Amino acid sequence: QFRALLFDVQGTLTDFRSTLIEHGLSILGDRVDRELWEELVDQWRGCYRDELDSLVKQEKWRSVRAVYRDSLINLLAKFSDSFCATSAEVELLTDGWERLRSWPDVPSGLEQLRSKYLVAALTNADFSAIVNVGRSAKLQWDAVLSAQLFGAYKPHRSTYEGAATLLGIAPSEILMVASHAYDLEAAREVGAGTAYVRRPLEYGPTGRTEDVPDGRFDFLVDSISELADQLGCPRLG
Amino acid sequence: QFRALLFDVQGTLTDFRSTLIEHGLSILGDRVDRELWEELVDQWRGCYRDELDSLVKQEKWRSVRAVYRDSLINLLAKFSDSFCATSAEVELLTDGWERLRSWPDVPSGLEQLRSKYLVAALTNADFSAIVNVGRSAKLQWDAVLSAQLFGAYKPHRSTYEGAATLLGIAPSEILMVASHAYDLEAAREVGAGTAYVRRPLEYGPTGRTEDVPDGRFDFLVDSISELADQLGCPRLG
């Protein structure tokens, strides 16, 4: 069936929200409260995807770190009555995105898959960012692929097809793995397999995610270890 | 001093000659004698080098797999009196270059360096080839980089500069590691440190290797683990 598994990373494998909440509360200290900062974090994620959505239609690529920084600065202006931050603090706050921890199933799941499949990241994050998160989130890849290599973000066909060309495999022999349906739907359009990972805590203990029904994608799992089971990979020691 | 180590792979970390000799004898069996096959492998490697030297001068890039395949077809014609190969066998023999075994020091040496440094591959081999070599050679990277990503082979400055921009690290904070002096000299020009790894068996128990004196490059070692020691990395368990 498949030769390689292509992974979305942010949210799919990493809990970005907990880190950005705790990191921002560490940096800003007594100057911001949980509900103020949590509301900021949630609008920040929206601003990034809205800018990335705009860039895809326009067929342009830019530093994704710069996207995060630009949208944070815009949000800090909105909240300028409540608190402020220096340029250095804006840099440290923006760095939170590159210190993500992975969900607890991920490292054992990724290793268990490596016995039958090549495992690569295909991320919209900049190349250096995914390399950096790899250390804090304990990710170990066969290859790292980023929108920066292709000059185009997912859901663009160029990213999935370029990933397949670089890997030397037909798109039909890629299983694409993601906790975001848009990413899986685009991969299906190039012939790739689809595997959805439910992440109920991706947007916090409250706040819900897509209750995906069975049969929309080829697999629907609650962990990478579970996906590995269904792909004929044995459990580790 | 250094944030990342950039590794050449073929030869520096992998014994391509032992691999291709035993790989060919497995495919061809009794139809060729070992000493004859050894002569083809040594000329095959020579063809590959002469071809890459000319493509570098012309500033062109082409699939390195096709370089191996086209040069093999020429040598099979030259040796056609002694043995022959089917079209399928030509593909299998060319696959040997994507199944290289690593020198015995390398896997633990790479692991020991990961405690303090980012480790990435930078090879002239195509992207799919270096991914496959990671399994056969048991290499574990933070990132994998290929001349295919840049449309230019080492020693072109664009390859070292592209790697630095992809990893987000200043070339002065990159240590280049190789058993080939051309590669280290070119990285020195871009601003990186240099580490020469002596591989006397790279071209066989017979044949010869390069002369590097002490003080020509920043480090001169006999194994990756020695390099890690000289870089302040604690030993493994």
Side-chain angles (χ1 to χ4, degrees), chain A residues 113-119 126-128 131-132 134-135 140-145 148-149 165-168, chain B residues 113-119 127-128 131-132 135 139-145 148-149 165-168:
Chain A
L113 282 168
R114 288 185 234 122
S115 323
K116 247 94 184 182
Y117 307 98
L118 301 177
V119 293
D126 292 343
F127 196 95
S128 58
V131 169
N132 286 329
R135 288 301 179 107
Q140 171 63 46
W141 302 107
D142 286 288
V144 167
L145 306 176
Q148 183 175 16
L149 305 174
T165 302
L166 278 183
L167 290 175
Chain B
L113 274 160
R114 279 201 302 274
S115 75
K116 249 101 149 108
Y117 299 118
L118 293 174
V119 298
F127 196 92
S128 58
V131 167
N132 285 123
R135 297 311 192 85
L139 312 176
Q140 208 87 73
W141 303 110
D142 287 287
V144 175
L145 311 175
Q148 180 180 12
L149 296 184
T165 295
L166 283 177
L167 299 174

Side-chain angles (χ1 to χ4, degrees), chain B residues 56-130:
Chain B
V56 153
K57 210 226 182 285
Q58 246 166 278
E59 281 176 74
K60 142 170 208 72
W61 176 90
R62 84 176 261 225
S63 157
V64 159
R65 182 177 172 86
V67 163
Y68 283 123
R69 172 169 199 290
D70 292 349
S71 60
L72 174 67
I73 283 160
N74 291 317
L75 298 169
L76 289 164
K78 169 182 173 160
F79 291 85
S80 58
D81 218 47
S82 306
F83 69 102
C84 47
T86 62
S87 291
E89 286 172 337
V90 171
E91 300 300 323
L92 300 184
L93 295 162
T94 295
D95 282 339
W97 293 99
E98 310 190 15
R99 315 275 183 248
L100 310 179
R101 324 176 207 171
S102 59
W103 305 106
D105 51 287
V106 175
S108 58
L110 269 189
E111 149 159 281
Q112 143 166 28
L113 274 160
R114 279 201 302 274
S115 75
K116 249 101 149 108
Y117 299 118
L118 293 174
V119 298
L122 175 64
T123 178
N124 283 333
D126 301 342
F127 196 92
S128 58
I130 171 63

Side-chain angles (χ1 to χ4, degrees), chain B residues 14-44:
Chain B
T14 47
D15 185 358
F16 61 76
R17 192 178 185 261
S18 305
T19 304
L20 259 300
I21 288 168
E22 317 284 348
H23 185 75
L25 294 177
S26 287
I27 299 289
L28 298 170
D30 303 19
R31 305 129 80 169
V32 72
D33 324 284
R34 160 177 301 265
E35 192 80 8
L36 188 62
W37 181 245
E38 280 187 77
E39 319 285 32
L40 191 146
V41 171
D42 275 4
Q43 298 179 37
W44 201 357

Side-chain angles (χ1 to χ4, degrees), chain A residues 50-207 209-219:
Chain A
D50 277 15
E51 167 71 346
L52 259 64
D53 274 338
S54 165
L55 274 199
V56 166
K57 283 229 345 132
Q58 285 180 10
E59 298 200 70
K60 293 179 179 179
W61 171 90
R62 75 182 290 237
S63 176
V64 159
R65 181 185 172 91
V67 171
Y68 281 130
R69 184 185 196 268
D70 289 359
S71 45
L72 170 66
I73 284 140
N74 267 36
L75 286 155
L76 293 169
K78 211 214 253 213
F79 296 81
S80 59
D81 289 342
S82 308
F83 70 94
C84 53
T86 58
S87 296
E89 285 170 330
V90 163
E91 294 301 320
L92 299 166
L93 285 167
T94 285
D95 295 13
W97 292 101
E98 304 190 13
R99 300 181 206 217
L100 304 186
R101 278 176 55 150
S102 58
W103 303 112
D105 54 295
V106 162
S108 99
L110 279 181
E111 194 175 313
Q112 162 176 3
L113 282 168
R114 288 185 234 122
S115 323
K116 247 94 184 182
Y117 307 98
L118 301 177
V119 293
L122 177 68
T123 186
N124 278 336
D126 292 343
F127 196 95
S128 58
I130 171 65
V131 169
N132 286 329
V133 175
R135 288 301 179 107
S136 59
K138 282 150 82 103
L139 312 168
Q140 171 63 46
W141 302 107
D142 286 288
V144 167
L145 306 176
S146 153
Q148 183 175 16
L149 305 174
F150 311 112
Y153 310 102
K154 308 176 311 184
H156 209 91
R157 270 190 23 214
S158 178
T159 64
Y160 309 98
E161 300 202 293
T165 302
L166 278 183
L167 290 175
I169 62 201
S172 67
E173 318 211 80
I174 287 175
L175 179 58
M176 178 85 197
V177 187
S179 71
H180 311 104
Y182 93 88
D183 189 1
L184 298 180
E185 283 313 353
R188 172 144 54 203
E189 272 183 344
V190 315
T194 50
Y196 185 86
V197 193
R198 298 200 281 251
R199 292 297 190 193
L201 300 160
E202 175 165 353
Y203 303 118
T206 59
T209 69
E210 261 227 27
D211 211 276
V212 159
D214 273 292
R216 159 175 208 211
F217 306 113
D218 302 315
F219 306 82

